[PDB]
Design a protein around this ligand. Structure first.
Ligand code: NI
Ligand code: NI
Ligand code: NI
Ligand code: NI
Ligand code: NI
Ligand code: NI
Lengths: 221, 207, 230, 207, 221, 230
């Protein structure tokens, strides 16, 4: 779990075997073209395999304690499967703050990309994110996830060779403010480390009480 | 660009003159009930259908979407004022109220939508096909129509941003970003400003 | 006139003895499922008890009767200012069954969406004299308390407390447990509202000047409006 | 008990009629400057001394102290309106503004202190020796005095509670506690209510 | 350091020897009577010995880390020296939320009594405090301090035998909200215990960072 | 056009080289006092350096010249939105002198009252090439950075950071350090204001339509008003 700047990497969300089973199912579906500057391919949002596998990705992420701690998810925009090859790219843009989903409107606090192609198997296709804190290129291993704020100016550089398949999504967090969400995450991770280091049980409970209190003060459901 | 006249915004030419005639042709053929003013029944099928057309047109209007940040519409109602008919001072979650004018302001005497502000009040009668958008909490009235007739569509809506000041600040920021986009201003600054806009929208929105 | 015991409040006689008996007659004829698994505690907890399935029709129905009764109880409404309940769950403790020290999760999922757990509540459905042990021990910054109330009484307490149900070594403890999100998030604000309300009620009972009662009610409703998050 | 007439409070009989005559006797002997109305110089020693007497009397008045929760006074100024003299609509940290009336309202034509509210506006002319207290942010005017003369003391002050609504809620709570104290209500409830009052004052005060 | 309910006891703020030296100085001064229902004795606020020794009490309290942690003092109402004997008492009352001091107005967040008589040496003179949380009688050892919220309904019961000398004061905290102030105190004390238990330095720093952040979010200076 | 490096910002050439030289000439002739004692760090810290006394007249005077210069610097004002400074202190590091890992206190006392330490700042008064070591290492949740800037440049950073000054093993590092309370408490808000301001300045330099510049400035001032605590 790497906390490189403003963005967080969750490695091995799915295994290499699970990624292959995901790809065998996804590759069989009908990849539709589009320009919605952008030129790439996607599975239709209502494709039943896309819907089913997107639910599997959400279930898996919701079963990951570090993901849950870092993002405190309230509601996901259902995963969207995308593909970039032969010069396909998504130019610099800012994501909209509000997005319409099948179960109402959500505030896009965080964006997330699950990689379904190995980085060595495609030239280009880097996810470049740019903020007031800085700039980074992201091209993680198949099964790994990058979680980043939706406010970032970003792009997917052209894939000049091979192909890049990934699941993309947005999510509304229970904690709106990034500063508050990072403080909670910091406190939770200290509690986890102290638990692993066998610290006094009374202090683990006291700190967990502080955490509970802050989450109760700052959450918006 | 189109600014805010204090605490209220005018969206001109939501419908063309030809379109407004076509709306009036359909509306005028319906049964107007004496409910002091007049109106079409909320469940009148032509009122419900034109109400839906008004909503679709408004949601397709970037300036309206930006000004209101609509979350939920309450279906438009159709009213009419003539021969001394008026609506006294009153306050009407409805965040915003709107009137789409369906009669030209010159074709009737009186019938001014008077809306109170912090600084005083504003009297509004816009061109047929134009809309006025204002906070539902504002004290307001429709002065008597002593000659001619005033037909209009009136509606309420929940906004994504409940605070009036926050909603205008966002609108002004958005409107300036568009104007700079038409002027071909530096890309990096257009992005930096949009970033500021979306950050404020993330801070202030309630869905 | 009800008062807090530190950070908790007891609401007595929510159901009569005869109603508790009828509730038990219905509950006892259902399928009680052994549970050694925690759900709702912040860290891993040593739990061993019996429960009715959350979707048991009789459990759902009586859960609704409990919520309906609580919503009709003026002192419960004043103390908790309920916005949304996590539907009541029925649990039982006997033969060494216990729920170890833990803190309840701040956020819980319910069928009608996610709620913030402002307050926890237990409706007692066995008489405290009829079982040994089974004390709800609630600990916080401002002290510690052991609670076993009369059948049909309810205890209301913050979900943030460090708490446990000590082992029941003889007899059986049956109860309905729940959480709720209050209209008022902050505990200090919610307690000030309860205090103001309760004073208005005492002054009403004492036959105080109606204009003063009216004015104080106006103050109460203005505060409630300012501090509520609906 | 004495309630709030919407967003403004009237404090009657701050000074008696005899005392008001004594204040006017001293004030009327001074040099009034044409600064459209009139006033005494801020550094006029009799104006400064009577200004201090007004402040002392007000700070000794439980209803005023409770209504304003004064933190800091800006020294009272003395104005006069006659023969068409008026003060147009305007907004004036000054939290509150106050006028102590030094002429009987019947002894002059016009000269109404008009103050805008959320619901509309209020026209105020009180008895000599009475005071009106209102938010400084309120839009207001003094209508022309067409006959007789209107002498008054006007002042601003920082309150301990900046929010108008919070300040009225506290005042109403306090006023009800006093009334119940005069009625010999149960001691325990009088204490419980005072506890609620002081808790709100602790939450809302800015010193 | 006992956290009995809503109130906190700080024992041995001054030693028994220091209390005797305080009392030798205080007993020489002119004790003035008054009814400001109340009947007790006090030293005049402008008595130079009272002013000097009050400063010593504030200096000592500001040098006590647990006092500083619990109260987070911003400004004190200078200590007032009081004495109860021969039926003298202070009946049930609520302290005013706002108090005027020589250096401006303060909000009375907390009240505090430093005991300068041993409890065994006077019959009665109990400080009875009553809140929504409950009720307590307080009559601590000479040199010990009780710190309690100023919102409490309270009294000093009559002293029927001997005498009770004490320093009383109010203080405005940097953190207005009691709930927030207790959470900070809880977090600080966990950090101190973990430091004493030799927990990983990185976690002590992380938790101290959380504390710093919360104090910066909630303080009012 | 200045930009943040993660959570910190460098303001270059606050004073010219000639002015830094004149500042050093005045500072060097004063009495430097050996200090092994921490003041302003949250926990006990291993510190060993030299400082000028806080009440040294020349230190007070040059501290005022530094604050005056910073207040006249548009980019410093935009980044920090200063409300109140803790008056600058002059420190020096040589011959193994260092300031170990610590976090600065959230609240500091000053002669004109208590301040909240929103931001920390160091004005460099030795060239980074003229000493070995003495890097200001600033660490937080979002990364770590080592800073040694040109003489007369300033680094501005959050006081919440875990940070140290690594040992100076050759030459000497002289600097002025300070804290400040910003008009805007929240760092996220303060950064959004800086971003908006800086864009308006770039658009001004690019000769953008004056009505748009005016409108954007109105937005900026409305935000500043909403988020300031004066
Ligand atoms: Ni994107
Ligand atoms: Ni209306
Ligand atoms: Ni529990
Ligand atoms: Ni005025
Ligand atoms: Ni007292
Ligand atoms: Ni430091």
């Amino acid at each position: 779990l790497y906390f490189q700047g403003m963005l967080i990497e969750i490695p091995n969300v799915f295994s290499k075997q699970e990624v292959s089973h995901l790809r065998e199912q996804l590759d069989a579906r009908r990849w539709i073209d589009g320009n919605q500057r952008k030129r790439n391919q996607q599975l239709d949002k209502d494709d039943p395999v896309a819907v089913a596998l997107g639910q599997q990705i959400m279930d898996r992420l919701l079963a990951h304690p570090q993901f849950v701690s870092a993002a405190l998810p309230l509601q996901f925009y259902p995963p969207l499967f995308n593909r970039y090859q032969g010069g396909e790219t998504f130019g610099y843009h800012i994501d909209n703050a509000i997005r319409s989903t099948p179960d109402g409107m959500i505030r896009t606090d965080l964006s997330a990309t699950l990689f379904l192609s190995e980085p060595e198997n495609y030239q280009g296709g880097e996810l470049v994110i740019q903020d007031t804190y800085g700039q980074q290129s992201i091209k993680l291993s198949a099964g790994s996830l990058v979680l980043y704020p939706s406010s970032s100016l970003h792009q997917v550089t052209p894939v000049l060779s091979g192909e890049r398949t990934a699941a993309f999504m947005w999510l509304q967090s229970m904690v709106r403010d990034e500063g508050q969400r990072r403080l909670l995450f910091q406190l939770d991770q200290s509690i986890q480390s102290l638990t692993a280091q066998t610290a006094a049980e009374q202090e683990l409970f006291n700190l967990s009480g502080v955490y509970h209190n802050l989450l109760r003060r700052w959450s918006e459901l």
